[PDB]
Amino acid sequence: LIKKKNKDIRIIPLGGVGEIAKNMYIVEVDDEMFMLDAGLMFPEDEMLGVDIVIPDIQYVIENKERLKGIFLTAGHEHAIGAVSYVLEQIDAPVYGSKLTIALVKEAMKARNIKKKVRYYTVNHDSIMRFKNVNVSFFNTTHSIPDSLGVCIHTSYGSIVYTGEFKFDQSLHGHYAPDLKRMAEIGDEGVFALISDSTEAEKPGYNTPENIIEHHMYDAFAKVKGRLIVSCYASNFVRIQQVLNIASQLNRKVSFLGRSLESSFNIARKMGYFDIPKDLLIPINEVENYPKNEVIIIATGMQGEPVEALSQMARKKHKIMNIEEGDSIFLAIASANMEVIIADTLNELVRAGAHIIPNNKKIHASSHGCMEELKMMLNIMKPEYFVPVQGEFKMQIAHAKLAAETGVAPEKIFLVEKGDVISYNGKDMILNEKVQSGNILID
């Protein structure tokens, strides 16, 4: 006669607000706690002797008996970079797409962590049933395939976390978004939407990837010597574009960086790339070709591309350095990174390299611009809105979009790390803080 109902909700960012990476959002529904993403951030300019930055999870450790799962939206560093460190401290099942799980398993192997982990590979048809709530998933579009949003069903309506996403009609297959499923979620009733603010300041739409690839062909066709493309190892779309263009221009492709080899190998075995025969060469073989017959994709050792480019520009790289007359395509900017980018570009000009200019007509990111964020807000029609994944100015820009779409302004929460947004069935409040912070890994 009595149906179980939910009473108290908590939403707590431990990473990803006040900054551009390191997503980690804790959602509690009564006595069940869920961790949404567990990303890393690369060290800020002002940091020395540091490899990566991860969230402080002391609040989760203090309450770990209630942690029911870790839910990972995609296989990029902003979503999974901290997972291995989390798993060394707490035990919970790990839920993610086929690709995301394979990349997490590789990361655990790479750090030689042998604890038993309960992985669950989910897809957009999966419904994971807990005591208090059910969790479902929906395909999103990103630069890595097999990305998923997370939908926590409550008796107040859904709590939806988008992860990182954009909308681009030129991406299909494992990049295609679940627009019909998202409309169903919005119609059934969304209590709170937690959405990516990274490009909320940028009007219009991201430039479609087909048009980006056309522009890359035109730029690459003009390069007279070697080309170095600097991008994230998780930018599979960009890697695929380079492979296609290299084939068209009779250039070979070689990977520089442990991050790329690893992620590419896994993704290739699983079928995620279209790779012509004889296109890929070992980095050791690059110097055996004419300069105009090679493209080097340079990701970082830990996945940070700019650090590797800086090493190459100063001729400090262990494996391969920049030479006069090389050309650079920089396919990666946050407040955290603006200084190293400026210094690296100066270093490259000093070394006699040629930076391929950005096209004014082109805006390339993995994150929705204003119209894409408004599309998500209009589909989901949330009662409350929590903009995340951004510096505070980005969160504010995203809050402005939500107000434009009709979210009540007093139901928009602009949060800092460690803030607790809480609901008791009557009022949504911001009246508590938990421990949070940046953990430095060396």
Coordinates of C-alpha atoms in Angstrom, one line a residue:
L1 CA 0.0 0.0 0.0
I2 CA 3.0 2.3 0.7
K3 CA 5.5 3.2 -2.0
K4 CA 9.0 4.2 -0.9
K5 CA 9.6 7.9 -1.6
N6 CA 12.7 10.1 -1.7
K7 CA 13.0 12.9 0.9
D8 CA 16.4 14.6 1.0
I9 CA 18.7 15.4 -1.9
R10 CA 22.3 16.7 -1.7
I11 CA 24.4 17.9 -4.7
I12 CA 28.0 18.6 -3.9
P13 CA 30.7 19.5 -6.4
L14 CA 34.1 18.2 -5.4
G15 CA 35.8 19.2 -8.7
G16 CA 34.9 21.0 -11.9
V17 CA 33.6 24.4 -10.7
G18 CA 35.8 27.4 -10.4
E19 CA 38.0 25.6 -13.0
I20 CA 38.0 23.7 -16.4
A21 CA 38.7 20.0 -15.8
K22 CA 38.5 17.6 -12.7
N23 CA 34.8 16.9 -12.8
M24 CA 33.4 15.2 -9.7
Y25 CA 29.9 15.7 -8.5
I26 CA 28.4 13.9 -5.5
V27 CA 24.7 13.3 -5.5
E28 CA 22.9 11.9 -2.4
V29 CA 19.4 10.7 -2.3
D30 CA 18.6 10.0 1.3
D31 CA 21.1 7.3 2.5
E32 CA 22.5 6.5 -1.0
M33 CA 25.5 8.4 -2.4
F34 CA 26.7 8.5 -6.0
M35 CA 29.9 9.9 -7.5
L36 CA 29.4 11.4 -11.0
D37 CA 32.8 11.5 -12.8
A38 CA 36.3 11.5 -11.2
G39 CA 38.5 13.6 -13.5
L40 CA 42.0 15.1 -13.3
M41 CA 43.3 18.6 -14.0
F42 CA 46.7 19.3 -15.4
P43 CA 49.0 21.5 -13.2
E44 CA 48.6 25.3 -13.2
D45 CA 51.5 27.4 -14.4
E46 CA 52.3 28.3 -10.8
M47 CA 52.8 24.6 -9.9
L48 CA 56.2 22.9 -9.9
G49 CA 57.0 19.2 -9.3
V50 CA 53.4 18.2 -9.9
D51 CA 52.2 15.7 -12.5
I52 CA 48.4 16.0 -12.1
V53 CA 45.8 17.4 -9.7
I54 CA 42.9 15.4 -8.4
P55 CA 39.9 16.1 -6.1
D56 CA 40.1 15.8 -2.3
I57 CA 37.6 13.0 -1.5
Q58 CA 37.8 13.1 2.3
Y59 CA 34.0 13.9 2.4
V60 CA 33.3 10.7 0.5
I61 CA 35.7 8.7 2.7
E62 CA 34.0 10.0 5.8
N63 CA 30.7 8.7 4.4
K64 CA 32.0 5.8 2.3
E65 CA 29.5 3.2 3.7
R66 CA 26.8 5.0 1.7
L67 CA 28.7 5.2 -1.6
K68 CA 26.7 3.0 -4.1
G69 CA 28.6 3.7 -7.4
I70 CA 30.9 5.8 -9.5
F71 CA 29.3 6.8 -12.8
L72 CA 31.7 7.8 -15.6
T73 CA 30.4 9.8 -18.5
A74 CA 33.2 9.3 -21.0
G75 CA 36.9 8.1 -21.3
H76 CA 38.6 11.5 -21.4
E77 CA 40.8 12.9 -18.6
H78 CA 38.2 15.3 -17.3
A79 CA 35.9 12.4 -16.5
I80 CA 38.2 9.5 -15.5
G81 CA 41.7 10.9 -14.8
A82 CA 41.3 10.5 -11.0
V83 CA 39.5 7.2 -11.0
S84 CA 42.5 5.0 -10.1
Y85 CA 43.4 7.3 -7.2
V86 CA 39.8 7.2 -5.9
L87 CA 39.8 3.4 -6.1
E88 CA 42.9 3.2 -4.0
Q89 CA 40.9 4.9 -1.2
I90 CA 37.4 3.6 -1.5
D91 CA 35.5 0.6 -3.0
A92 CA 32.4 1.0 -5.1
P93 CA 31.3 -0.4 -8.4
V94 CA 32.3 1.6 -11.5
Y95 CA 29.7 2.2 -14.3
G96 CA 30.6 3.4 -17.8
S97 CA 30.3 2.7 -21.5
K98 CA 32.2 0.0 -23.2
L99 CA 35.1 2.3 -24.1
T100 CA 35.2 4.2 -20.8
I101 CA 35.5 0.9 -18.8
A102 CA 38.3 -0.4 -21.1
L103 CA 40.2 2.9 -20.6
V104 CA 39.8 2.8 -16.8
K105 CA 41.0 -0.9 -16.7
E106 CA 44.1 0.2 -18.7
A107 CA 44.8 3.1 -16.3
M108 CA 44.6 0.6 -13.3
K109 CA 47.0 -1.8 -15.2
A110 CA 49.4 1.1 -16.0
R111 CA 49.7 2.0 -12.3
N112 CA 49.9 -1.7 -11.3
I113 CA 46.9 -1.6 -9.0
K114 CA 45.6 -5.2 -8.5
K115 CA 42.6 -4.7 -6.3
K116 CA 39.4 -6.4 -7.6
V117 CA 37.1 -3.7 -9.1
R118 CA 33.5 -4.3 -9.9
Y119 CA 33.2 -2.8 -13.4
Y120 CA 29.7 -2.5 -15.0
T121 CA 29.6 -1.7 -18.7
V122 CA 26.4 0.2 -19.4
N123 CA 24.8 1.6 -22.5
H124 CA 21.8 3.8 -23.2
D125 CA 19.4 0.9 -22.5
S126 CA 20.8 0.1 -19.0
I127 CA 18.8 0.9 -15.9
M128 CA 20.8 0.3 -12.7
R129 CA 18.5 -0.3 -9.7
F130 CA 19.6 0.8 -6.2
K131 CA 17.5 0.9 -3.0
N132 CA 16.2 4.5 -3.3
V133 CA 16.6 5.3 -7.0
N134 CA 17.1 3.9 -10.5
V135 CA 19.9 5.3 -12.7
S136 CA 19.6 5.5 -16.5
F137 CA 21.9 6.8 -19.3
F138 CA 21.7 8.6 -22.6
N139 CA 24.2 9.0 -25.5
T140 CA 25.8 12.4 -25.8
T141 CA 28.1 13.8 -28.5
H142 CA 31.7 14.6 -27.6
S143 CA 35.2 14.2 -29.2
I144 CA 35.5 10.7 -27.7
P145 CA 32.9 8.1 -28.7
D146 CA 30.6 6.2 -26.3
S147 CA 29.9 9.2 -24.1
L148 CA 26.8 9.0 -21.8
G149 CA 24.8 11.5 -19.7
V150 CA 23.5 10.2 -16.4
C151 CA 19.9 10.4 -15.2
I152 CA 19.1 9.7 -11.5
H153 CA 15.4 9.1 -11.1
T154 CA 13.8 10.4 -7.9
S155 CA 10.3 10.9 -6.7
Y156 CA 10.8 14.7 -7.3
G157 CA 11.9 14.0 -10.9
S158 CA 15.2 13.3 -12.5
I159 CA 18.7 14.6 -11.6
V160 CA 20.5 14.8 -14.9
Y161 CA 24.2 15.2 -15.3
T162 CA 25.3 15.9 -18.9
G163 CA 29.0 15.4 -18.6
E164 CA 30.8 17.2 -21.4
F165 CA 28.8 17.5 -24.5
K166 CA 28.1 19.4 -27.7
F167 CA 25.6 19.0 -30.6
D168 CA 27.0 18.5 -34.1
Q169 CA 24.9 17.0 -36.8
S170 CA 28.1 15.9 -38.7
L171 CA 29.1 13.4 -36.0
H172 CA 27.3 10.0 -36.3
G173 CA 27.6 6.4 -35.1
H174 CA 29.2 6.2 -31.6
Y175 CA 29.2 10.0 -31.4
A176 CA 25.4 10.4 -32.1
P177 CA 23.2 12.0 -29.4
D178 CA 20.1 10.5 -28.0
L179 CA 17.8 13.4 -28.8
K180 CA 14.5 11.4 -28.6
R181 CA 15.6 9.8 -25.3
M182 CA 16.6 13.3 -24.0
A183 CA 13.1 14.6 -24.9
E184 CA 11.5 11.8 -23.0
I185 CA 13.6 12.6 -20.0
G186 CA 12.6 16.3 -20.2
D187 CA 8.9 15.4 -20.7
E188 CA 8.8 13.0 -17.7
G189 CA 10.2 15.8 -15.5
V190 CA 13.7 17.0 -14.7
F191 CA 14.1 18.2 -11.0
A192 CA 17.7 19.4 -11.5
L193 CA 20.0 19.7 -14.5
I194 CA 23.9 19.7 -14.0
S195 CA 25.4 20.9 -17.3
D196 CA 28.8 21.8 -18.9
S197 CA 29.6 25.5 -18.9
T198 CA 32.9 25.5 -20.7
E199 CA 31.8 27.4 -23.8
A200 CA 28.8 29.2 -22.3
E201 CA 30.4 32.6 -23.1
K202 CA 30.6 31.8 -26.9
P203 CA 27.6 32.8 -29.1
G204 CA 26.1 30.4 -31.7
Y205 CA 27.2 26.8 -32.3
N206 CA 30.6 25.0 -32.5
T207 CA 31.8 24.8 -36.0
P208 CA 30.6 21.3 -37.3
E209 CA 33.5 18.8 -37.4
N210 CA 33.1 18.2 -41.2
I211 CA 33.8 21.9 -41.8
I212 CA 36.8 21.8 -39.3
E213 CA 38.2 18.8 -41.3
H214 CA 37.8 20.7 -44.6
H215 CA 39.7 23.6 -43.1
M216 CA 42.4 21.3 -41.7
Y217 CA 42.9 19.8 -45.2
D218 CA 43.4 23.2 -46.7
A219 CA 45.9 24.3 -44.0
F220 CA 47.8 21.0 -44.1
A221 CA 48.0 21.0 -47.9
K222 CA 50.0 24.3 -47.7
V223 CA 52.6 22.8 -45.2
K224 CA 56.0 22.4 -46.9
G225 CA 57.9 20.4 -44.3
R226 CA 57.0 18.4 -41.3
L227 CA 53.7 18.9 -39.5
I228 CA 53.2 18.4 -35.8
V229 CA 49.6 18.3 -34.5
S230 CA 49.3 18.9 -30.8
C231 CA 46.0 17.6 -29.3
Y232 CA 44.5 15.5 -26.5
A233 CA 44.9 11.7 -26.8
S234 CA 41.2 11.6 -26.1
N235 CA 40.3 13.8 -29.1
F236 CA 39.4 10.8 -31.3
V237 CA 37.6 13.0 -33.8
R238 CA 40.7 15.1 -34.3
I239 CA 42.9 12.0 -34.6
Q240 CA 40.6 10.5 -37.2
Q241 CA 40.6 13.8 -39.2
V242 CA 44.4 13.8 -39.2
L243 CA 44.5 10.1 -40.4
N244 CA 42.0 10.9 -43.2
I245 CA 43.9 14.0 -44.4
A246 CA 47.3 12.3 -44.2
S247 CA 46.0 9.6 -46.5
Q248 CA 44.9 12.3 -49.0
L249 CA 48.2 14.2 -48.9
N250 CA 50.5 11.1 -49.1
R251 CA 51.8 11.7 -45.6
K252 CA 52.4 9.0 -43.0
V253 CA 51.3 9.5 -39.4
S254 CA 53.2 8.8 -36.2
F255 CA 52.3 9.1 -32.6
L256 CA 54.4 10.8 -30.0
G257 CA 53.4 10.2 -26.4
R258 CA 52.5 7.2 -24.2
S259 CA 48.9 8.5 -23.7
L260 CA 48.2 8.3 -27.5
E261 CA 49.7 4.8 -28.1
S262 CA 47.7 3.4 -25.2
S263 CA 44.3 4.9 -25.9
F264 CA 44.6 4.4 -29.6
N265 CA 45.6 0.7 -29.3
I266 CA 42.6 0.0 -27.1
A267 CA 40.2 2.0 -29.3
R268 CA 41.6 0.5 -32.5
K269 CA 41.2 -3.1 -31.2
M270 CA 37.6 -2.3 -30.3
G271 CA 36.9 -0.9 -33.8
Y272 CA 36.7 2.9 -33.1
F273 CA 39.0 4.1 -36.0
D274 CA 39.2 3.9 -39.8
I275 CA 42.9 3.4 -40.5
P276 CA 44.3 2.9 -44.0
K277 CA 47.0 0.2 -44.5
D278 CA 50.6 1.4 -44.4
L279 CA 49.5 4.9 -42.9
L280 CA 50.9 4.6 -39.4
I281 CA 54.6 4.4 -38.8
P282 CA 56.7 4.0 -35.6
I283 CA 58.1 7.3 -34.3
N284 CA 61.7 5.9 -34.7
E285 CA 61.0 5.6 -38.5
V286 CA 59.9 9.2 -39.0
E287 CA 63.4 10.5 -39.7
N288 CA 63.7 8.0 -42.6
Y289 CA 61.0 9.9 -44.7
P290 CA 61.1 13.3 -46.5
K291 CA 59.9 16.0 -44.1
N292 CA 56.9 16.7 -46.3
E293 CA 55.7 13.1 -45.9
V294 CA 55.1 13.0 -42.2
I295 CA 52.6 14.1 -39.6
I296 CA 53.4 13.7 -35.9
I297 CA 50.5 13.7 -33.5
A298 CA 52.1 14.8 -30.2
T299 CA 50.0 14.3 -27.1
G300 CA 51.6 14.6 -23.7
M301 CA 53.2 11.9 -21.7
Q302 CA 50.4 12.1 -19.2
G303 CA 48.0 13.4 -21.9
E304 CA 48.8 17.2 -21.6
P305 CA 49.8 18.2 -25.2
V306 CA 51.2 21.7 -24.5
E307 CA 53.9 20.5 -22.1
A308 CA 55.2 18.0 -24.8
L309 CA 55.1 20.9 -27.4
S310 CA 57.1 23.1 -25.0
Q311 CA 59.7 20.4 -24.6
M312 CA 60.0 19.9 -28.3
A313 CA 60.3 23.6 -28.9
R314 CA 63.1 24.0 -26.4
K315 CA 64.8 20.8 -27.9
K316 CA 64.5 19.1 -24.5
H317 CA 62.2 16.3 -25.6
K318 CA 63.6 12.8 -25.1
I319 CA 62.3 11.3 -28.3
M320 CA 61.7 14.0 -31.0
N321 CA 62.3 17.8 -31.1
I322 CA 61.1 20.7 -33.2
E323 CA 63.3 21.8 -36.1
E324 CA 63.4 25.1 -38.0
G325 CA 60.7 25.0 -40.7
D326 CA 58.3 22.6 -38.9
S327 CA 54.7 23.6 -38.9
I328 CA 52.4 23.3 -35.8
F329 CA 48.7 22.8 -35.6
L330 CA 47.5 23.5 -32.1
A331 CA 44.4 21.5 -31.5
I332 CA 43.7 22.1 -27.8
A333 CA 42.6 27.2 -23.6
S334 CA 41.8 27.7 -19.9
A335 CA 42.9 30.3 -17.3
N336 CA 44.8 27.4 -15.9
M337 CA 46.8 27.0 -19.2
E338 CA 47.0 30.4 -20.7
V339 CA 50.5 31.2 -19.6
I340 CA 52.2 27.9 -20.7
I341 CA 50.4 28.3 -24.1
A342 CA 51.8 31.8 -24.6
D343 CA 55.3 30.8 -23.6
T344 CA 55.2 27.7 -25.8
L345 CA 54.1 29.8 -28.9
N346 CA 57.0 32.2 -28.2
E347 CA 59.4 29.3 -27.9
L348 CA 58.2 27.8 -31.2
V349 CA 58.6 31.1 -33.1
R350 CA 62.1 31.4 -31.5
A351 CA 62.9 27.9 -32.9
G352 CA 61.9 28.9 -36.4
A353 CA 58.7 26.9 -36.5
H354 CA 55.5 28.0 -38.2
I355 CA 52.2 28.1 -36.2
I356 CA 49.2 27.5 -38.4
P357 CA 46.9 30.4 -37.8
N358 CA 43.4 29.9 -36.3
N359 CA 40.6 30.6 -38.8
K360 CA 38.4 33.4 -37.5
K361 CA 35.4 31.6 -39.0
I362 CA 36.2 28.5 -36.9
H363 CA 35.3 27.8 -33.3
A364 CA 36.4 24.2 -32.4
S365 CA 35.7 22.7 -29.0
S366 CA 34.2 19.5 -27.4
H367 CA 31.7 21.6 -25.5
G368 CA 28.4 23.2 -26.4
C369 CA 28.4 27.0 -27.3
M370 CA 25.4 29.1 -26.3
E371 CA 22.9 27.6 -28.7
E372 CA 23.9 24.0 -27.9
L373 CA 23.6 24.7 -24.1
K374 CA 20.1 26.3 -24.8
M375 CA 19.1 23.2 -26.8
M376 CA 20.0 21.0 -23.8
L377 CA 18.1 23.4 -21.4
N378 CA 15.0 23.5 -23.7
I379 CA 14.9 19.7 -24.1
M380 CA 15.3 19.0 -20.4
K381 CA 13.1 21.8 -19.0
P382 CA 14.7 21.5 -15.5
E383 CA 13.1 23.0 -12.4
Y384 CA 16.5 23.7 -10.8
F385 CA 19.8 24.4 -12.6
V386 CA 23.4 23.8 -11.5
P387 CA 25.9 25.0 -14.1
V388 CA 29.2 23.2 -13.7
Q389 CA 32.5 22.6 -15.6
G390 CA 33.7 26.1 -15.7
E391 CA 35.4 29.1 -14.1
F392 CA 32.9 31.2 -12.3
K393 CA 32.4 33.6 -15.3
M394 CA 31.5 30.6 -17.4
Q395 CA 29.0 29.4 -14.8
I396 CA 27.4 32.8 -14.7
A397 CA 27.2 32.9 -18.6
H398 CA 25.5 29.4 -18.4
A399 CA 23.1 30.6 -15.7
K400 CA 22.2 33.6 -18.0
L401 CA 21.3 31.0 -20.7
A402 CA 19.1 29.0 -18.3
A403 CA 17.2 32.1 -17.3
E404 CA 16.7 33.0 -21.0
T405 CA 15.2 29.5 -21.6
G406 CA 12.8 30.0 -18.7
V407 CA 14.5 28.5 -15.6
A408 CA 13.4 30.5 -12.6
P409 CA 16.4 32.7 -11.6
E410 CA 16.0 31.9 -7.9
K411 CA 16.3 28.2 -8.9
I412 CA 19.7 28.6 -10.4
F413 CA 22.6 27.7 -8.1
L414 CA 26.1 29.0 -8.7
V415 CA 28.4 26.8 -6.6
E416 CA 32.0 26.5 -5.5
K417 CA 33.9 23.3 -4.6
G418 CA 32.6 21.8 -1.4
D419 CA 29.2 23.7 -1.4
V420 CA 26.2 21.6 -0.5
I421 CA 23.0 22.2 -2.4
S422 CA 20.2 20.5 -0.5
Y423 CA 16.5 19.9 -1.0
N424 CA 14.0 18.6 1.6
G425 CA 10.8 18.5 -0.5
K426 CA 10.0 22.1 0.3
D427 CA 13.0 24.4 -0.2
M428 CA 16.3 24.1 -2.1
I429 CA 19.1 25.7 -0.1
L430 CA 22.8 26.3 0.0
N431 CA 23.6 26.2 3.7
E432 CA 26.5 23.9 4.3
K433 CA 30.1 23.3 3.1
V434 CA 32.1 20.0 3.2
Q435 CA 35.9 19.6 2.8
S436 CA 37.2 20.0 -0.8
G437 CA 40.3 21.0 -2.6
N438 CA 43.1 20.3 -5.0
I439 CA 45.3 17.3 -4.3
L440 CA 48.7 17.5 -5.9
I441 CA 50.2 14.2 -7.4
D442 CA 53.9 14.0 -8.3

